[PDB]
Design a protein around this ligand. Sequence first.
Ligand SMILES: CCCCCCCCCCCCCCCCCC(=O)OC[C@H](COP(=O)(O)OCCN)OC(=O)CCCCCCCCCCCCCCCCC
Ligand SMILES: NC(=O)C1=CN([C@@H]2O[C@H](COP(=O)(O)OP(=O)(O)OC[C@H]3O[C@@H](n4cnc5c(N)ncnc54)[C@H](OP(=O)(O)O)[C@@H]3O)[C@@H](O)[C@H]2O)C=CC1
Ligand code: SF4
Ligand code: SF4
Ligand code: SF4
Ligand SMILES: [Zn+2]
Lengths: 146, 289, 114, 155, 48, 206, 176, 94
Amino acid sequence: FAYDGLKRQRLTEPMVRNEKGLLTHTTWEDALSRVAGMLQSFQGNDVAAIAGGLVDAEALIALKDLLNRVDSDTLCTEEVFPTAGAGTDLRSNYLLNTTIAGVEEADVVLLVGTNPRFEAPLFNARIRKSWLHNDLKVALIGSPVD
Amino acid sequence: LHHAVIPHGKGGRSSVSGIVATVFGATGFLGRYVVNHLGRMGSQVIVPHRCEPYDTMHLRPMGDLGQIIFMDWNGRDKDSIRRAVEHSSVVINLVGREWETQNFDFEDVFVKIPQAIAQVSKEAGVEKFIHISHLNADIKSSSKYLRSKAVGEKEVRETFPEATIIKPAEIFGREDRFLNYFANIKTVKQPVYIVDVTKGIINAIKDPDARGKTFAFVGPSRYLLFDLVQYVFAVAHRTTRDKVERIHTTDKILPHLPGLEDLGVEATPLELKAIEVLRRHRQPAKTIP
Amino acid sequence: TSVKPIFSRDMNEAKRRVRELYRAWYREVPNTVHLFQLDISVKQGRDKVREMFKKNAHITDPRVVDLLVIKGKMELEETIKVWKQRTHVMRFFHETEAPRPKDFLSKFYVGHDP
Amino acid sequence: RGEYVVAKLDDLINWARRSSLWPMTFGLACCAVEMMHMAAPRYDMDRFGVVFRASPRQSDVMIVAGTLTNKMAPALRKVYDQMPEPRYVVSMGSCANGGGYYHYSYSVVRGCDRIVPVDIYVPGCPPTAEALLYGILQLQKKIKREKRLRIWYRR
Amino acid sequence: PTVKPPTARKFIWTNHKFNLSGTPQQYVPYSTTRKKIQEWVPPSTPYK
Amino acid sequence: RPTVRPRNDVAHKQLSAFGEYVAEILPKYVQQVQVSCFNELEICIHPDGVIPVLTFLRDHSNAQFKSLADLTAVDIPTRQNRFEIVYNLLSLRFNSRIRVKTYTDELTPIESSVPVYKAANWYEREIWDMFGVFFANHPDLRRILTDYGFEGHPFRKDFPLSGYVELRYDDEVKRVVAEPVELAQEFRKFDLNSPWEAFPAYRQPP
Amino acid sequence: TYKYVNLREPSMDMKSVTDRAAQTLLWTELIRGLGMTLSYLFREPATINYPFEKGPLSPRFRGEHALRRYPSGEERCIACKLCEAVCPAQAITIEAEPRADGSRRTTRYDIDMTKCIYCGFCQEACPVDAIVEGPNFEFSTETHEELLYNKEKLLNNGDKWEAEIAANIQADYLYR
Amino acid sequence: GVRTSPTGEKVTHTGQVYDDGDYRKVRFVGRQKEVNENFAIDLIAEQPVSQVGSRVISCDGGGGALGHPRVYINLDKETKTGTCGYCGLQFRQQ
Ligand SMILES: CCCCCCCCCCCCCCCCCC(=O)OC[C@H](COP(=O)(O)OCCN)OC(=O)CCCCCCCCCCCCCCCCC
Ligand SMILES: NC(=O)C1=CN([C@@H]2O[C@H](COP(=O)(O)OP(=O)(O)OC[C@H]3O[C@@H](n4cnc5c(N)ncnc54)[C@H](OP(=O)(O)O)[C@@H]3O)[C@@H](O)[C@H]2O)C=CC1
Ligand code: SF4
Ligand code: SF4
Ligand code: SF4
Ligand SMILES: [Zn+2]
């Protein structure tokens, strides 16, 4: 039901700041020329980028490639993950390695610091299915949410 | 931008170009090509016409449904000018006779009317204004036609400073009063093709660098009036005092002004198109380097 | 990989038919230009025929070539018999279509299509 | 006065031209049959001064009565270009008005107004012979409103 | 209708109109639906 | 039963017997024979058998199919031979009809049947025009229904309904010009098929 | 059973041969043909005096479309889109949403009268007698755009023509 | 409920009007905007609520086979009236 949010507060035009400091519509040529000029005058740590929560992989790699062309590695996300140890070197460090369908074969689930019902509702529905049909045992560490 | 004028489609008859153009003098020789090109890419075109609706019927098939709108206007009436321009984003002026009439002299059509359109357009908020003058416009000119153009060119530039003023040589084309003028009969002429002029005007609408500028639209080659006229009869296998003054006026050379090549339009030689114009009437002409 | 031939049993015999069709088209262009009172020069007409032929230079199936020749002979017949009108002959030249740019930036500015 | 003179000269040629409308009919398809029924005795278009069979060289109005295909579009435009002026076009039926029931076809021109200018659109698939007669009488009233001479005088 | 008059209704036109094509009263088509996508309006106060 | 079309067993048996008759006589070409529940006989043959099978049906004394009612094609993209060529013949002597079917693809030529029926002339031109099937030894194969210089075969299932180009008169060049098709209103596709099976008797095994 | 249209033997006796000779030379059949056209000159013509006289039409006649109302003035249309589904020409375009009072009603209802084939399938398919083809057939226009009806045009047609439309439906609805 | 906007254009019963900066209103210059002035939403609100003596009432819109499909309306709630989903007539229980 959130799709209706795709019809409102939409960005439909490039915008740059005018002499008043206010955003004003402009062409793709103008907006990109302004961005390119700044990009060509900076290097290394002077350039960074933060990726949001709905960004696709094609945009993520393109932006990575572009900042690498100016020798920047500051490609960051908004969602933290401890970089200590292996960090992101090994995929298994940050994956749901059992898979969603694997919950139906587990016999004990330990949930640590999370509310799966609202964070991953269909993943929580898959736990309840195991809890119902397999007598799965579930333990939680954290706030006693429903 | 406004949501209704964002371009859409692939630039064809049913597309949306984003241009809402009011074209004064659209029922003549240049206007038909201008309106045709505007409607090719899906522009909203307002056509203020002084003439019969019957004389505007050749413009109806030039735009998809609803894209060509017709209004009555009177050059002396400012309200009728206001009605036709207050919704447009660009106003194009192609008004002008090649002769004087008891009701309108060259001052009326080349000074009073262009200035009235420019004043109303400025007040109404129109952002783009394109005004057609002449290459040989000059207050020191023998031709009253060309003297009026120079004055009107000045008043247009002072009333609508951002106006793009275009100065073409004599234009040759199927309906022209140039090659057809000779075929029905010291000076160096540099005539320009009608389609090139049309593209130049359209490209000026789309180019922000063209605002406030004056252009000179001239063909690729300069000819001697005698040599050119000989060519016309060879291809065709064969009037007023002022008209003769203009045809005998050497085409000015204005290197400082931008031209068609600035607007990305490659000028077309007269030799590729002379047959097109003159076939209906049934060896090159030395060029001046 | 056993198939019924159209006309030619291998690409050698097919190339012969292509060359004969090309000669017929090449000789016809001056007549077409005159008969249809075209505003293109004979050189433009011949360069168009050449460009139409080179478009299919990469084919290696003798059956596909045979159909291309069969279609081309039909087009040539329609031109010689004056079954086509001048509008049909000039549709090879796309004279009222604005050049569509082919580089990335031009496409990006104008729309979404690749 | 000269105003009053052109007013009556306008009324005269306009009266003459709408009292003598000679059509040539592109009977392209179905709608031609209803056009024939308008010439038939019940409606007798000839009694309005509209002759039945007129050569294209002497025609004043073209009636596009039926579907205009892509293969036929060049021929329609040819005949229109050869009509001497003044000339008017009546578009008859959904097909000619805008493609109609074959609008989405690959071989059909979506409205004859893409090829020639049109003065009157007669709706229907097909319009009744009397509906077409209404459109013809509406063209006469359109001609009656013409003011070529008054505009010429004011040039 | 002098013998069997039509059924009166509140909304039926009291004044009949003839064909209005070619006059100032002619029908002009337009889309009866409202705008579907709302654009974001940038803030008025400066902040960069 | 008032609302149900009655069966005709006499005609069904008779058409089946003639189906075997033809198959026994021309085993070199007949691949299948079937009779529909509304009594229409179909002979499915190898394409090499066009001329022999049609000549036999026209001239044989117990056939005598003198009239070629219709000749058409059907595009079925899922088949490797996407085109199915259908001959519908009529016998006045025996007051009967028969359908003969063969197949081809975009490149394999079919033998022209003009020698057997002069009616096939324009029908085969239409098939070439609409489907792109080439008929060998046709006295005059060329388009018949489409515009001159028209590219493509409109009746193929993958040819779009509104085509690729559209015409208009352009005042700049003073002639009718062709341009890529743009529609003010796109044709609206409807998904009408119900997700529930209607005819169990035609179910295909999984 | 059959008959011959032209399998006759012309008599070759002198009387018959002279009958055909007199016919050839005296043009008797041609003069007989003149009699038939003469009898028509004195027949009353079948022309009617349009627009002061109209050709006869029945209550079922399919003419210009209109959107109808209930006696209270409420619109009959409920945006069910059965008309749009059946339209053979795809001439109808509909959009709908809940009205301010919660009713199921259209926000768009257009008919491209230059796509329409005037088949009447839409009035057959409508479950509430909302869309009809009325008796008007005299609505030719001077521009293409005038024939692209939207909901405001269609409702105005209903209000304009309801008196006659209701009487026509009253006459024919027992055959539906 | 015909209502003109600040630009003077009438707002239709679907709430449609061209905003100030919309070029598309040039189509009405020298002509007119077809607007039907009998708003169905206002007309049905003028109809009184019927008082009935049963929990369930049926509506066919009037005119028998000339109305809409016959439906049955439950009148158990007392907070609001029962509305016909086809014609919008309202019923209340007594
Ligand atoms: C005592 C001694 C006396 C000696 C003299 C005796 C002479 C009298 C006896 C001889 C009679 C002579 C008749 C002269 C008239 C011409 C007859 C004639 O030529 O008819 C033959 C001609 C062709 O007939 P066809 O069917 O084609 O067969 C022959 C072709 N191999 O048929 C045709 O003409 C074709 C028909 C053409 C006409 C069609 C259109 C008009 C028909 C109606 C006109 C009515 C007549 C109007 C009378 C005008 C009076 C002012
Ligand atoms: N073509 C050429 O050789 C050159 C042309 N130009 C300029 O280009 C413009 C158009 O060229 P062209 O198209 O050839 O001129 P045209 O005469 O071909 O068309 C002129 C237009 O002006 C309109 N017009 C003329 N006088 C009046 C008036 N008093 N009130 C209202 N409308 C009027 C005409 O409308 P109506 O049909 O109602 O008279 C017509 O539409 C002119 O300004 C001309 O000076 C410049 C250089 C060369
Ligand atoms: S508009 Fe209707 S009647 Fe006329 S040609 Fe087309 S389908 Fe036939
Ligand atoms: S009459 Fe037929 S074609 Fe016209 S809108 Fe109704 S269903 Fe569609
Ligand atoms: S007019 Fe009738 S069929 Fe069409 S959407 Fe409205 S209620 Fe449904
Ligand atoms: Zn109800």
